[PDB]
Structures are given as C-alpha cells and as structure tokens.
Design an enzyme around this catalytic site. Structure first.
Site, short mmCIF file in Angstrom:
data_model
loop_
_atom_site.label_atom_id
_atom_site.label_comp_id
_atom_site.label_asym_id
_atom_site.label_seq_id
_atom_site.Cartn_x
_atom_site.Cartn_y
_atom_site.Cartn_z
CG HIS B 41 -1.42 6.58 63.22
ND1 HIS B 41 -0.60 5.98 62.28
CD2 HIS B 41 -0.99 6.14 64.43
CE1 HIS B 41 0.28 5.20 62.90
NE2 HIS B 41 0.06 5.28 64.20
N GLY B 142 4.12 0.71 69.57
CA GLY B 142 5.10 1.64 70.13
C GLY B 142 6.26 1.99 69.19
CB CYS B 144 3.69 3.83 64.98
SG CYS B 144 2.67 2.38 65.48
#
Lengths: 300, 299
Positions: B41, B142, B144
């Site tokens: 993503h 932040g 991920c």
C-alpha cells in the site's frame, strides 16, 4: 491501539553482556572498555547465609573467575568492589563498547531491562521505578547482573544492574556507582520494602491514555485545584503533582484539563467498582507522561 | 518471580530496518540481501479510496521510491508485488543481513514486534496471534511495515509485517509469503474482524501464573474434567484443550491440577465481580504455556 508497556531496542547493549562465574555462582556482567561490572555476591562462598564481603575479597583468586562473551574469554587482571558491584579489569577492550553515560533513575521514572541468563541476553521489557527503590519485573535464578538502560535523544545511559528479589517479590538492583536503589543490603536478610507511593504524574498520564483510547466513563467535568489535590495526596500515598505543564499537549488533544483528571483520581482511588480502565481494575502508575505521549503520538 | 509480557532481543533485526517512501506515503521496509520488503500500500496514490493495485503498478516510476537507512539512500532497480507485499530489488546488499528463515505464526502463538517509525527502530514488545489472524499491538500512523519475528534455538524467523488497523482497533499484517493473516484485504475498507476465540491453553497458563504469583481468590472446591470443559468451550468462543501434558510442572508446584483451573475459566467468563488477576479485570490469553513456564520457575 491501547496502552501497553514497551522497551526501547536492545541492540547497543547486547554485545556488552558477558557470562561471569566464580565457584558455583554464575551470573551476568556488563563489559565496557577493559572492565566488566557484575554483582559482587558472585564471589561469595555461600550466598544463602550472611556474607562477610571483606573476607571473600581477601581470599579471592583471580584465575578462578571465568568471564566470557561467546568463545571470547577475558582474563581478569584485577578485582575491586565499587559499592555493591564488583569491577573486573580484564585483558581485552570490548570492541563493541557503545558510546554511553551513567545515571540514576528516580521514583516514577521508566527504563528498559535486558534480562540475561548466564551471559546470554534473553528478553527485554519496560519497567518503572517505585518510591521505595524497587521495580516489578520478572527475574529468576540466574538473571542477576541483568542490565537496565535508557536512551534519551541518542544518548545511551546505563542505569541499573540486578541483584536480588525481596521476600515480597519486588526486585532490587544498583546503579553503576554501586549504590543499591532503595538502600537495600546485598545479603540474604529479612528487609521489608515498605509502603509504596503512587506517582500522580504517571496516573494522570494513564488516564489521558484511556481518554485517547475512547474510555471516558471516569470523567467528572468537575475540576480539583492542584493545591487541594496535593494536600489530599500527602495523606493517601500519592506524590504531589509538579505542575500541569507536562500535560499541555495531552489536555489540548483530549479537551480534559489536568484538574478534571485530578478529581477523577480522588474518586477512582475509592474503587473502580465493577468497571475497568484500559482493562485494569485499579489505577496504574507505570506509564510516564513521556511514555504515553510517544506511544500515542510518536514524536518522542 | 513475577509475570511480564516480554520480547526477545532485537539486535539482529534493527540493522535491517529501512525507511521507504513513495508519493505522500512514508513507512518501514525490511532489508535482506539486495531486497527490501514493505506493505504494497505504500504505492497507493490515494489511500482514502479503494485502491486498484494493477493500475498503481502499471504507472510506477522507480525513481519515485526513496529507500534509505540512516541518511544513506539505496537505488531501486525494480519492483514487483508478492501477494500483499511489495518487493524492491535495490542496488546494494545489506551487509548486516542476519541468517534467517520465514514462517507463519498460528493462532495462540506469541511473537515479537519491533515497532518502527518511518525507518527508525523505536520499541520492542511481545504480542500473541488472535484466532481471526489479528494482534493487539500498538501501532500508530507511521509504523506500517514494522516487523514481527521469533527466535527459536538460535534461529531467527521473520513472521509478520504490519499493514493496517481495522475499525475495531485490531491489527492486521501479512507473512513473508505475502499472504495477509486472516485474509483481510489491504484496502481502506470497513471490514470487520470477526468473532474472537480465546486460547484456552494460554488462559490456563495465565491462571497458573496468578497462583504462583499469589492470587487464589478464583480457585474453588471444584473440578471440571477435560472432556466436559472442551464441550462448554465450543459454544463460548474458547478453544479446545488437547491435554494437560503441558502443565505438569505448573500443576505440580501450585498443587492445582489443570482440571480445577478449567473450572475457574468457565466461572470467570461472566465477570470478575470487580476483582482482578495479575492486575487485569478480565481473562488474558496473551501468554502461552511455554512463555509462562520459562518465567515461573526457570528453564
């Protein structure tokens, strides 16, 4: 993401853990430069009965120490006590000595524990220092010598070295000047911990974390002045709140002033009844204002 | 004595953490060999709307990626999807790549998370996999791309990479095969978690720890046999208990044989009546029998 206790990364510390044995005693030490520090009770003949440390030292034979990192063996060229810690000058400088300083932790402050077993780092977790100089961690036989450290803006401070467990289960250690936190003796004795005083700073921080998480049932919309709270605290085993300045961004973010949380504390200290906060059944003082702010917003 | 959720040391993993950006997205990646893995993503041009990954892949421009460690950048030579993971070949081999393996975590199993903020290792903590394939971690925007791993007999295994948070606060990630645990989609959708099933062997371990630690209030003049408990378990979101084999030493030192603790579980599910166990107001299934045994009288 609710409130959970974390530890800062352990990589800088791990290369400094060594195995220290003498006689039938085995524990952990910390190797920085040409020195290894570890609890002094490792040289005691029988750690089960009162130790005469002056005599254990006079009878000490240096080649009876076995100090090792992995396959690396460190000859001990001298030994001296520095308070309750033994300081071993050895024949090699640790090539992975990180840049560091030493400092002492105060009541209510948090730090990291690198729990080690016979010279091998095993786990890492966060702890918080209680008013009587003890921590509620998890140490078993063989974890003596484990190291506590804190990183503050790139600076690594070594701050604790594990020594023993009180009869009530609390854990006791020393700083690197060799002073034992809480003043406890490194002997097998009946010393008592005493009454612990809750850190209002951290409990206010715990409630902010709960708000940020969506729980507001303890919210009173009634505020208690810092002075009234402080007088109440001196009588209910909680510390006096410094100023409300540490919570500025938290109060702004949740819309709840510190004074309303102070009113919540006095009431919640009576008892949560059948309710919980961040899944706890009573107030928690293990998280500092800075821990919560970093965990919730991550700007450190 | 004492029971705390712990994490295994992070020294081997920290050197592998990198910052990966693309567009307005900045998250973390894992650098092993000449490859960097991160949540795909990071490629999404708009994370507020359904993402079409074929289209974002077709229009990708390698120069738009930024991959770095400390203030040092790496060149991205190619990019491909592997399930929900993005793999980027970079112009350089991580000289600090530890020896490692990859494996999937199962429900009820514990592992470590190295929580990272935009390329930088920030904290380490232990978690435990829930039945629906999620974990209850602490991840904020932040983090991920943060990495889950386990150490067993000196072998390091990478087991999870963080992708997203569901509306109910539960955390979702994938394994290194690119499969999302629980089969959740890597989309900004409102997908639900599903019914959570509590791990029984972990709950018994926890109760044993409470005994060893000194709390007894929940133990009574009663016993519920293995077979009958496993029956209540099936319709009350609780797993089945293979055997009592795992608790020999716990049952031995506490004096409470397993079947008594099974009786406690059934009776606590309705509430603790305001009491607590190791400070919690409800049952905890975050610790495995092995995790507890190692912390109770030591292995």
């Amino acid at each position: 993401s609710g409130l959970r206790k974390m530890a800062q990364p352990s990589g800088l510390v791990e290369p400094c853990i060594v195995r220290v044995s003498y006689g039938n005693n085995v524990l952990n030490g910390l190797w920085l430069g040409d020195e290894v520090i570890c609890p002094r009770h490792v040289i005691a003949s029988d750690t089960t009965r009162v130790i005469n440390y002056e005599n254990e030292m006079s009878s000490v034979r240096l080649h009876n120490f076995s100090v090792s990192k992995n396959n690396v063996f460190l000859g001990v060229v001298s030994a001296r006590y520095k308070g309750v810690n033994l300081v071993l000058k050895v024949n090699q400088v640790n090539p992975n000595t990180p840049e560091h300083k030493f400092k002492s932790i105060k009541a209510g402050e948090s730090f990291n524990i690198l729990a080690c077993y016979e010279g091998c780092p095993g786990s890492v977790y966060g702890v918080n220092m209680r008013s009587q100089g003890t921590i509620k961690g998890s140490f078993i036989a063989g974890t003596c010598g484990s190291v506590g450290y804190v990183l503050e803006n790139g600076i690594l401070y070594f701050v604790y070295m594990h020594h023993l467990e009180l009869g009530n289960g609390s854990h006791v250690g020393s700083n690197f000047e060799g002073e034992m936190y809480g003043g406890y003796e490194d002997q097998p004795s009946m010393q008592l911990e005493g009454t612990n005083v809750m850190s209002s700073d951290n409990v206010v921080a715990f409630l902010y974390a709960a708000l940020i998480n969506g729980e507001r049932w303890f919210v009173t919309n009634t505020s208690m002045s810092l002075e009234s709270y402080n007088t109440w605290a001196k009588t209910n085993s909680f510390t006096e709140l410094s100023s409300t300045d540490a919570f500025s961004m938290l109060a702004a973010k949740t819309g709840q002033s510190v004074e309303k949380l102070l009113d919540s504390i006095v009431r919640l200290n009576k008892g949560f009844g059948g309710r919980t906060i961040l899944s706890y059944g009573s107030l928690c003082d293990e998280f500092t204002p800075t821990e919560v702010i970093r965990q919730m917003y991550g700007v450190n």
